[PDB]
Amino acid sequence: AVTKLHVDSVTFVPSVKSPASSNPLFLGGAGVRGLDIQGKFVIFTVIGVYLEGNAVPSLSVKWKGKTTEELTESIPFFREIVTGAFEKFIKVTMKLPLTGQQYSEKVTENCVAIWKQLGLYTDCEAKAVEKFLEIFKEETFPPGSSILFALSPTGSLTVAFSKDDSIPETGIAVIENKLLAEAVLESIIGKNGVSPGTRLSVAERLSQLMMKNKDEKEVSD
């Protein structure tokens, strides 16, 4: 069930080693981030989402048996993935050239308003966003380069970069803020996310994996 995925011209492998924990993570799903510009659907980035193996049995408790459609429309299901006490990893590969400032401002364009809406915006989050922006401030990402995000089980966000599809053995910096960490993944597969394709892909694959898990345990190690 955990096969590689070909999205646009990129190929996401079945498993990657987390630059933060060095633990293996399986390919949950992949898709593109694009938008209609003057009549043409322009693809900006190609995204892959990886999850920790223990996430399958964890999610199975409440979601085993749900169909792809049921999981795709489920706000609670994806919120459980985003806030789950397990590691998540995101590989964002550029198709179009993007500057670190453009990209970082795009990923965080809604989180502040969202946190204020929920009454959760504190100085900790303000500092986290500032740090996030500083990390990307002077970076440039040509087509083919990648931005890697590792979300720890407790909410720490590790940021790393790559010139291609390779995954570095360690990250660049870590932002210790659960809300910002979750916001990065939410911006992709959440209800207000930018990639319907990635959300659908994750739903489809997890629906199948949760009905297997038991005695197949394909996400072990």
Curated annotation (Swiss-Prot):
Miscellaneous notes: Part of the biosynthetic pathway for all classes of flavonoids, a large class of secondary plant metabolites, many of which are brightly colored.
Induction statement: By light.
Tissue specificity as recorded in UniProt: Mostly expressed in siliques and flowers, and, to a lower extent, in leaves.
EC number: 5.5.1.6
Pfam families cross-referenced by the UniProt entry: Chalcone
BP term (GO), one: response to UV-B
Reaction equation(s) it catalyzes: a chalcone = a flavanone
Pathway assigned to this chain's UniProt record: Secondary metabolite biosynthesis; flavonoid biosynthesis
Root EC class: isomerase
Keyword RNA-binding: no
Residues the record lists as binding substrate: 45, 110, 187
Protein name: Chalcone--flavanone isomerase 1
GO CC annotation terms, alphabetical: chloroplast; cytosol; endoplasmic reticulum; extrinsic component of endoplasmic reticulum membrane; nucleus; plant-type vacuole membrane
UniProt keyword annotation of Transport present: no
InterPro entries linked: CFI (IPR044164), Chalcone_isomerase (IPR016087), Chalcone_isomerase_3-sand (IPR016088), Chalcone_isomerase_bundle_sf (IPR016089), Chalcone_isomerase_sf (IPR036298)
Family: Belongs to the chalcone isomerase family.
Tree of life domain: Eukaryota
GO molecular function, one term: chalcone isomerase activity
Site description Important for catalytic activity, residues in chain: 103
Function per UniProt: Catalyzes the intramolecular cyclization of bicyclic chalcones into tricyclic (S)-flavanones. Responsible for the isomerization of 4,2',4',6'-tetrahydroxychalcone (also termed chalcone) into naringenin.
Keywords tagged on the record: Flavonoid biosynthesis, Isomerase
